[PDB]
Amino acid sequence: PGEEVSQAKQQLKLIIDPYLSVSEVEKVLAACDFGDLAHTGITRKYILHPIAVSCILANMRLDPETLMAALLHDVIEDTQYTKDDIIERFGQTVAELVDGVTKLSNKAASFRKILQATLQDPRVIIIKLADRYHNMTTLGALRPDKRARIAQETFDIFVPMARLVGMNEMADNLENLCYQNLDLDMFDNVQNALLQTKPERCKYQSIWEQNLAELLHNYHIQGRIKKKNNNIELLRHFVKNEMDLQELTHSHAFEIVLQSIADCDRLVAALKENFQVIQYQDHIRRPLPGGNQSLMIKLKGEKTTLSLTIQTELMRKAARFG
Numbered sequence: 001p002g003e004e005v006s007q008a009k010q011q012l013k014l015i016i017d018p019y020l021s022v023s024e025v026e027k028v029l030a031a032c033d034f035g036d037l038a039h040t041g042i043t044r045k046y047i048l049h050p051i052a053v054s055c056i057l058a059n060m061r062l063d064p065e066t067l068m069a070a071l072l073h074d075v076i077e078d079t080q081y082t083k084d085d086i087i088e089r090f091g092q093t094v095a096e097l098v099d100g101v102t103k104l105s106n107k108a109a110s111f112r113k114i115l116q117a118t119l120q121d122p123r124v125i126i127i128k129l130a131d132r133y134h135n136m137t138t139l140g141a142l143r144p145d146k147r148a149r150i151a152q153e154t155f156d157i158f159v160p161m162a163r164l165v166g167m168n169e170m171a172d173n174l175e176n177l178c179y180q181n182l183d184l185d186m187f188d189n190v191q192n193a194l195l196q197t198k199p200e201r202c203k204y205q206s207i208w209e210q211n212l213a214e215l216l217h218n219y220h221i222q223g224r225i226k227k228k229n230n231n232i233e234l235l236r237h238f239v240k241n242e243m244d245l246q247e248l249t250h251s252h253a254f255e256i257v258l259q260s261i262a263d264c265d266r267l268v269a270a271l272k273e274n275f276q277v278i279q280y281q282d283h284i285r286r287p288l289p290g291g292n293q294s295l296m297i298k299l300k301g302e303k304t305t306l307s308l309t310i311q312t313e314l315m316r317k318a319a320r321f322g
Helices: 002-016 021-036 050-058 064-071 092-103 108-120 122-137 144-164 167-181 185-220 231-237 245-249 260-273 311-322
Strands: 225-230 251-258 276-282 295-300 305-312
Touching: 002 021, 002 050, 021 050, 021 064, 050 064, 050 122, 064 092, 064 122, 092 108, 092 122, 108 122, 108 144, 108 251, 122 144, 122 167, 144 167, 167 231, 185 225, 185 231, 185 245, 185 251, 185 260, 231 251, 245 305, 251 260, 251 311, 260 276, 260 295, 260 305, 305 311
Parallel strands: 251 305
Antiparallel strands: 225 251, 276 295, 295 305
């Protein structure tokens, strides 16, 4: 009954209370109540899908305008109202975001529309990405052939679009759900080998945190080494490659935090003398779309593969907190 709708609104409220002011929390919940006023759940339901979408956004510390727009999904094209959002308390920005998202809902023409919307207001893409994340979760009921078709569209379009707009955690989560729906047996085989080798890979990761710390000391570079999770990279690799348990146990990801760009360049030079450079990417000189900067280097010490992300203290706080 309405006890599901009102219980969902309180779940959203638990997320927005910590970072959004009470005046803004009033506005977001007002949109939620308006979304339900327009809607009668006749379609196998939907007010709760937009609330579940808005909860994903609320968890990413999204602004109140983006959250109201998510809640008012399909309210001006599917409901008996239009331009009602501007007239309502919601206002122009919300009506604009609402329309923008319905516009994004003919192969090449779709790609143009997605790209264009990114340059207009990335918040339209951020809402679209949360909506596709929520769909990947609720894909279970569908036939295995259909599930792998939606998963493939998400893999090709939404996973790279999410990295492009800076939402890398959201992209890793989306990519994970894609592999699950593309080939469940392959996902299960690889997740099992990852679980099996987890204790030993953690033991060698601590060893390499010490080896890298010793290298910084030997080469006279001041830094911090942070252990990084790399489950998605191992999964991405072994879903398309034969299993090798020594290679799976000895692959580690790290974040090295330095003081200066001169030290970042000084570290890459030192690493080149002690390892085989498999891959290198300079995002300091050529920042990623969205301003984030780092040097990415993939190394091959005998048996061990290391995936490093070299950054300064400042570059790290700009990337983590804007």
